[PDB]
């Protein structure tokens, strides 16, 4: 259904490129959904899509030396967003 | 291996298709056991590939384009007169190629669900709902809540007019034929995004938000397929399933799912297979067997559906599935769904006219060209590897094809490199690195030009262009990474060739 592993590949002191392992979601799903917020803090995540058929994205424009909180969500052809998200936390 | 054994999901009814298998023995003697194995449909093609499996294999029928295109479903035989016995258009929902690859069962489709206590007339027009919702905002209530976000949702009002997904004629979709962005698809999607502007919709509903409003009598219909039908019953809502509402004088099209059976071509009893499916299963017998396990809804067979209609609401699942598109089983669909999404938020938001939107999603759906990496470098799709005369025009004189089941479509007239690899994490893409590095040097250095190829031009193609760039240039795989999605947007290796060019990083930088 949704993934299971979630790592940043590269980074630099602004931004993460991520990649998760979509091989485990079914073919049901057209997209997943990223969020990113900094780990404690009150403002609400920032979040955008990227199609079914990627595996990797970029996140840019953090703060440096920050605490994120990244989530990956997968999003079904039917129902849409799914539950059970994967997320990590990781410094810029 | 062996010497029947089906293979079927376990949401359905598996043990009435046991007794449609017991009373084949006691006319066989041949015996039939009905596994329902857990991630069933992904097993199929693990255990397929070698052959220990099934010999036939029920499932929806779009999973089964996948498995044509990777040979493990067998050409199946029916008689001219048994097609006869089905809807005819649920046997355009399975092919591959122009072939045959299974038998019909079962077919779903979206319908209008509509609250009798509130609204006992439902409308027959789409245009009749900004009036009705006027109407019901001055009691409080709402016309019509359904998901916005999927298209597989909002595409039906879009198709009314003539839009469509990929042209299918001949057996055969045509990927470079989308319906997207033509006059249809524009006055369908206008409409759905004047319901939203002008406050009749929101566009924020999804499929929650949508089943709440309207399990608790907020809202006067919505739109959903019979899987939504058990929720409604355990609320208070008294409701009805019918025919969708026609947009400008013609129908809605919602998409249409034919759960299906297909033979395992890689086993014996295919005879065997046939008999049992063909005389013993779709019959008005066998299918009510099956059907008193667990419903199956509306059936392909027209006998028996003739029954199952006594229920207006299969009835206008078969009503509303007749007047629909199959769902088309090509791997393109998913660029389709994720484009199509696109637009309708941009269009419903204002970011976005209607027409830019469908005009970016036709473009996003449609086949492309390949895509220029160095001088001598392309990267692009199976799709491409097929078009003689565009590749000559590029001077392509030399292919990497990156699959395990493409064919070279013209050998003697280019080199061909075979990298066979399935895109998974089981698959040691970077054992072929050096190999096909060299390949390429080798045809650079005698003038020549490659074009790297996988199915979609997206995980196992990119990955060897990234492994080139990195050993050539001695550069990190984020740089070589940066330069090819600069040129290839949708470019990803999967999660397993990512650490894999990861580690060929570290080599070449050592």
Same mark, same amino acid.
């Given at each position: 259904?949704?993934?299971?592993?979630?790592?940043?590949?590269?980074?630099?002191?602004?931004?993460?490129?991520?990649? *998760?392992?979509?091989?485990?979601?079914?073919?049901?799903?057209?997209?997943?959904?990223?969020?990113?917020?900094?780990?404690?803090? &009150?403002?609400?995540?920032?979040?955008?899509?990227?199609?079914?058929? #990627?595996?990797?994205?970029?996140?840019?424009?953090?703060?440096?030396?920050?605490?994120?909180?990244?989530?990956?969500?997968?999003?079904?052809?039917?129902?849409?967003?799914?539950?059970?998200?994967?997320?990590? &936390?990781?410094?810029? | 291996?062996?010497?029947?054994?089906? *293979?079927?999901?376990?949401? #359905?009814?598996? &043990?009435?298709?046991?007794?449609?298998?017991?009373?084949?023995?006691?006319?066989?003697?041949?015996?039939?056991?009905?596994?329902?194995?857990?991630?069933?449909?992904?097993? %199929?093609?693990?255990?397929?590939?070698?052959? /220990?499996?099934?010999?036939?294999?029920?499932?929806?029928?779009?999973? %089964?384009?996948?498995?044509?295109?990777?040979?493990?479903?067998?050409?199946?035989?029916?008689?001219?007169? +048994?097609?006869?016995?089905?809807?005819? +258009?649920? *046997?355009?929902?399975?092919?591959?190629?122009?072939?045959?690859?299974?038998?019909?069962?079962?077919?779903?489709?979206?319908?209008?669900?509509?609250?009798?206590?509130?609204?006992?007339?439902?409308?027959?027009?789409?245009?009749?709902?900004?009036?009705?919702?006027?109407?019901?905002?001055?009691?409080?209530?709402?016309?019509? $809540?359904?998901?916005?976000?999927?298209?597989?949702?909002?595409?039906?009002?879009?198709? @009314?007019?003539?839009?469509?997904?990929?042209?299918?004629?001949?057996? #055969?979709?045509?990927?470079?034929?989308?319906?997207?962005?033509?006059?249809?698809?524009? @006055?369908?999607?206008? +409409?759905?995004?004047?319901?939203?502007?002008?406050?009749? $919709?929101?566009?924020?509903?999804?499929?929650?938000?949508?089943?709440?409003? %309207? &399990?608790?009598?907020?809202?006067? $219909?919505?739109?959903?397929?019979?899987?939504? *039908?058990?929720?409604?019953?355990?609320?208070?809502?008294?409701?009805?399933?019918?025919?969708?509402?026609?947009?400008?004088?013609?129908?809605?099209?919602?998409?249409?799912?034919?759960?299906?059976?297909?033979?395992?071509?890689?086993?014996?009893?295919?005879?065997?297979?046939?008999?049992?499916?063909?005389?013993?299963?779709?019959?008005?017998?066998?299918?009510?067997?099956?059907?008193? /396990?667990?419903?199956?809804?509306?059936?392909?067979?027209?006998?028996?559906?003739?029954?199952?209609?006594?229920?207006?609401?299969?009835?206008?699942? !078969?009503?509303?599935?007749?007047?629909?598109?199959? $769902?088309?089983?090509?791997?393109? !669909?998913?660029?389709?769904?994720?484009?199509?999404?696109?637009?309708?938020?941009? =269009?419903?938001?204002?970011?976005?006219?209607?027409?830019?939107?469908?005009?970016?999603?036709?473009?996003? =759906?449609?086949?492309?060209?390949?895509?220029?990496?160095?001088?001598?470098?392309?990267?692009?799709?199976?799709?491409?590897?097929?078009?003689? /005369? !565009?590749?000559?025009?590029?001077?392509?004189?030399?292919?990497?094809?990156?699959?395990?089941?493409?064919?070279?479509?013209?050998?003697?007239?280019?080199?061909?490199?075979?990298?066979?690899?399935?895109?998974?994490?089981?698959?040691?893409?970077?054992?072929?690195?050096?190999?096909?590095?060299?390949?390429?040097?080798?045809?650079?250095?005698?003038?020549?030009?490659?074009?790297?190829?996988?199915?979609?031009?997206?995980?196992?193609?990119?990955?060897?262009?990234?492994?080139?760039? !990195?050993?050539?240039?001695?550069?990190?795989?984020?740089?070589?990474?940066?330069?090819? #999605?600069?040129?290839?947007?949708?470019?990803?290796?999967?999660?397993?060739?990512?650490?894999?060019?990861?580690? +060929?990083?570290?080599?070449?930088?050592?």
């Amino acid at each position: 259904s949704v993934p299971t592993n979630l790592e940043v590949v590269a980074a630099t002191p602004t931004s993460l490129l991520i990649s *998760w392992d979509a091989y485990s979601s079914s073919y049901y799903v057209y997209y997943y959904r990223i969020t990113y917020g900094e780990t404690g803090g &009150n403002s609400p995540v920032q979040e955008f899509t990227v199609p079914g058929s #990627k595996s990797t994205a970029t996140i840019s424009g953090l703060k440096p030396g920050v605490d994120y909180t990244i989530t990956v969500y997968a999003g079904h052809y039917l129902y849409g967003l799914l539950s059970s998200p994967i997320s990590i &936390n990781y410094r810029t | 291996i062996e010497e029947l054994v089906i *293979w079927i999901n376990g949401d #359905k009814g598996y &043990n009435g298709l046991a007794e449609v298998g017991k009373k084949f023995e006691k006319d066989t003697g041949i015996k039939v056991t009905v596994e329902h194995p857990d991630k069933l449909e992904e097993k %199929f093609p693990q255990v397929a590939a070698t052959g /220990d499996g099934p010999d036939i294999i029920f499932w929806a029928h779009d999973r %089964f384009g996948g498995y044509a295109q990777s040979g493990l479903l067998a050409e199946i035989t029916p008689a001219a007169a +048994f097609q006869d016995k089905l809807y005819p +258009f649920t *046997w355009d929902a399975v092919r591959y190629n122009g072939k045959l690859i299974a038998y019909p069962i079962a077919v779903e489709a979206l319908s209008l669900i509509y609250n009798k206590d509130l609204l006992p007339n439902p409308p027959k027009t789409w245009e009749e709902i900004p009036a009705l919702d006027k109407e019901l905002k001055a009691k409080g209530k709402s016309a019509l $809540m359904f998901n916005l976000q999927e298209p597989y949702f909002t595409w039906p009002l879009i198709a @009314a007019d003539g839009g469509y997904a990929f042209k299918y004629a001949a057996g #055969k979709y045509d990927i470079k034929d989308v319906g997207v962005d033509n006059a249809g698809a524009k @006055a369908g999607l206008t +409409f759905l995004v004047d319901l939203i502007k002008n406050k009749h $919709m929101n566009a924020d509903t999804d499929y929650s938000i949508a089943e709440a409003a %309207f &399990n608790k009598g907020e809202t006067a $219909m919505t739109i959903n397929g019979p899987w939504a *039908w058990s929720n409604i019953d355990t609320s208070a809502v008294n409701y009805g399933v019918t025919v969708l509402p026609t947009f400008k004088g013609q129908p809605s099209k919602p998409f249409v799912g034919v759960l299906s059976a297909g033979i395992n071509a890689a086993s014996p009893n295919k005879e065997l297979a046939k008999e049992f499916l063909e005389n013993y299963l779709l019959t008005d017998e066998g299918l009510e067997a099956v059907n008193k /396990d667990k419903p199956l809804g509306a059936v392909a067979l027209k006998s028996y559906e003739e029954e199952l209609a006594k229920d207006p609401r299969i009835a206008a699942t !078969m009503e509303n599935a007749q007047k629909g598109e199959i $769902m088309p089983n090509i791997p393109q !669909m998913s660029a389709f769904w994720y484009a199509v999404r696109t637009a309708v938020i941009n =269009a419903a938001s204002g970011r976005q006219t209607v027409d830019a939107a469908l005009a970016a999603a036709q473009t996003n =759906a449609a086949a492309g060209g390949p895509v220029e990496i160095l001088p001598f470098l392309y990267l692009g799709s199976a799709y491409h590897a097929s078009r003689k /005369d !565009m590749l000559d025009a590029l001077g392509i004189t030399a292919l990497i094809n990156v699959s395990a089941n493409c064919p070279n479509h013209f050998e003697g007239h280019y080199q061909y490199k075979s990298i066979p690899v399935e895109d998974n994490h089981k698959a040691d893409i970077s054992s072929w690195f050096n190999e096909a590095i060299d390949f390429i040097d080798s045809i650079k250095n005698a003038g020549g030009r490659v074009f790297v190829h996988s199915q979609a031009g997206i995980s196992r193609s990119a990955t060897i262009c990234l492994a080139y760039l !990195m050993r050539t240039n001695r550069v990190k795989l984020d740089e070589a990474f940066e330069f090819v #999605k600069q040129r290839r947007s949708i470019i990803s290796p999967n999660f397993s060739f990512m650490g894999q060019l990861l580690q +060929f990083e570290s080599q070449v930088l050592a």
